[PDB]
Ligand binder design. Structure first.
Ligand SMILES: Cc1ncc(COP(=O)(O)O)c(CNc2conc2O)c1O
Ligand SMILES: Cc1ncc(COP(=O)(O)O)c(CNc2conc2O)c1O
Lengths: 380, 382
């Protein structure tokens, strides 16, 4: 995959491999690892992250919705996949034909599905229980039993597992968390039989209490080397390795005279003669306008962004007359300077999770494995 | 093309067509229209909008960088395409064989290109002049004349046009706009001869001053039916037709008891008995966390978002019990209620341009033409 604009993201698969390996070491032998690769693996590349996680010790994969599971299958991934979110009862046959497990939490879903499907492939279901997140999941014992009854009755429906999700596993105070964990145990008792796969921990929960992860953990944010939250960082059992970095190059360089304005709205005025560099990245690439007033790295030095950020372009104040082609790092390291995704999330007034997901389809991803470029992916 | 999540965007190509067709009649008959379709047509679908615009009167297309132009050609587009942004002189040949025009703003670029290219396909260039935007473009007479001469010299280089871009055309006050217009006229005199295509007008400039557009306009934002700025809405010569809308469906419905928490951080807590719906759209789809105090349309009414927006979903307070599958409109109209891209932009404290561009690859685009679904585009579909 080649691309023709000097803007790209770099995904170090070694960082992903290591984050997964360290979790494997930490976790009891009986706890499996399910790599969470939804949203194109949090913007890092679904297949690339998936195959690497499987190498490091993960045996299963998780995605947000059916299409994401189908995209993995089409790309050659044959490992087990679980859709964490909702799906259509009408798509049960497709999921089954494609060996994709589905999350379920309503009895009417199963009834609708039973009327529309009768074989020949079995469908593996993971019952979602709401223990406090208030997102998806069954909440009454009567419903739980009805759902189980419908699955056991259908000759092609299988209850592979059951789970819940924690809403505050990344907060120092563990009051609500403990509440959710306790409620989960009580609800499990509603099941006539304990499914082979019981899981509940995400990155925060698994890393903090690896001994209360039952038989499978759903490793997400930490696999990409990003902390679940600022407050949990000083609690992480091992150093996370950031895998995502973002770069570009100066495509234009010019010296402005005092009084000259830059970008839309002419919001910036050069107070003194200075050199301005233009880079080929804008908000259509996920470098949102809110990043105005932020600093990028060039020649190992911080260079503030000047004026408003454009759809495809960006202007910065250079320390001096630098040549076109000079490497600009928006996320990553240059010399003794470093910009993390947390720094970017901070300025964007959001959390690390959102940043890589927002770097759009337009930005090619270059993959590094064993310190060598292994593959390049340009969505267009 | 199919998709398997109840979340999608609809692009009304009839609206696209009408916005461009109206511009066709507003402008002088000899003025060409270049449809700007960079960023996958501002998130509406590059080839679908490009093809539609050409039917409506547009004769040329514009993109941000080379990859977007090659994409259009791969998709069957044959009309002229100009790359507005920078490019690698090493890629000159490829662009030439693909009949893609390139923007140029410095002589050393031509030096490098000339050293690596010697035919057979001609490369058409559009010289960029910076008239106050401070992005790209030459700024002195010397450099200008040098670019022209280097183009003249090379047997396969051709100066097709010259242009500039306005930084404040969508502002009521026209002081800076006037300065830029006047500077552009001054800079045009630096050229030994006028290239066939002189241009400067974007949506705002073209719509407000159609008789000040030279021989070609670059129609962007208004083609999608979006006002260049809320400020000039009353100055619009003709009503724009909003092309983009975003929808979803409830995938779960439940009645919470007072005291129960919702979403990450246990941020929200129900005070009394209420109904909560869950929809399959989150920030990985472009529905940013920043929208947590915003709302959506359901059952023909405004339904506030509750708690924090997750990566793939969010919760909303329902007016009461509703069936799973009930349609939810994030951007569009339901009965006598409506949420526009401008509404989303205002809440997010950003401009309308950014909103559709942010609705990610993950969201399928359903295309309508002549009031019927024409095609579906699912970026991750089989
Ligand atoms: C059901 C489920 N399990 C595990 C994970 C992994 O969580 P982690 O990246 O903190 O390790 C997620 C993603 N959780 C989400 C984070 O933001 N929105 C989400 O849905 C999830 O939805
Ligand atoms: C050179 C050029 N011409 C024409 C247009 C169309 O502008 P319009 O959508 O206001 O009609 C743009 C896009 N203008 C941009 C808007 O944000 N960043 C941009 O580069 C552009 O960059």
């Amino acid at each position: 995959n080649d691309f023709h604009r000097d803007t790209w993201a770099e995904v170090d698969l070694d960082a992903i491999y290591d984050n997964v390996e360290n979790l494997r070491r930490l976790l009891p032998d009986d706890t499996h690892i399910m790599a969470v690769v939804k949203a194109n693996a949090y913007g890092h590349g679904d297949v690339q992250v998936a195959r690497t996680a499987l190498e490091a010790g993960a045996s299963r994969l998780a995605v947000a919705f059916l299409d994401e599971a189908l995209a993995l299958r089409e790309k050659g991934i044959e490992a087990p996949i679980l859709v964490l979110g909702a799906s259509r009862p009408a798509d049960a046959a497709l999921a089954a034909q494609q060996r994709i497990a589905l999350t379920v939490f309503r009895s009417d879903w199963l009834e609708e599905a039973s009327a529309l499907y009768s074989g020949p492939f079995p469908i593996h279901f993971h019952l979602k229980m709401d223990t406090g997140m208030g997102r998806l999941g069954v909440k009454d014992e009567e419903e739980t039993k009805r759902i189980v009854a419908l699955i056991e009755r259908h000759p092609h429906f299988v209850l592979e597992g059951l789970y819940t999700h924690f809403a505050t596993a990344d907060e120092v105070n563990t009051d609500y968390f403990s509440y959710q964990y306790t409620r989960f145990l009580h609800m499990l008792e509603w099941l006539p039989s304990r499914p082979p796969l019981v899981h509940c921990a995400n990155s925060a929960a698994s890393l903090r209490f690896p001994d209360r992860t039952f038989n499978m953990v759903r490793f997400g944010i930490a696999m990409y080397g990003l902390a679940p939250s600022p407050g949990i960082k000083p609690l992480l059992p091992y150093p996370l390795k950031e895998a995502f970095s973002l770069h570009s190059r100066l495509v234009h360089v010019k010296k402005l005279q005092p009084g000259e304005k830059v970008s839309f709205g002419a919001t910036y005025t050069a107070q003194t003669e200075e050199w301005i560099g233009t880079i080929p990245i804008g908000y259509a690439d996920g470098w949102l306008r809110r990043l105005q007033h932020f600093h990028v790295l060039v020649d190992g030095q911080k260079a503030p962004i000047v004026g408003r950020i454009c759809m495809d372009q960006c202007m910065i104040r250079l320390p001096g007359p630098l040549p076109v082609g000079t490497k600009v790092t928006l996320i990553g390291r240059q010399g003794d300077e470093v910009i993390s995704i947390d720094d970017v999330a901070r300025h964007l007034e959001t959390i690390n999770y959102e940043v890589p997901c927002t770097i759009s389809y337009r930005v090619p991803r270059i993959f590094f494995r064993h310190k060598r470029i292994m593959e390049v992916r340009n969505a267009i």
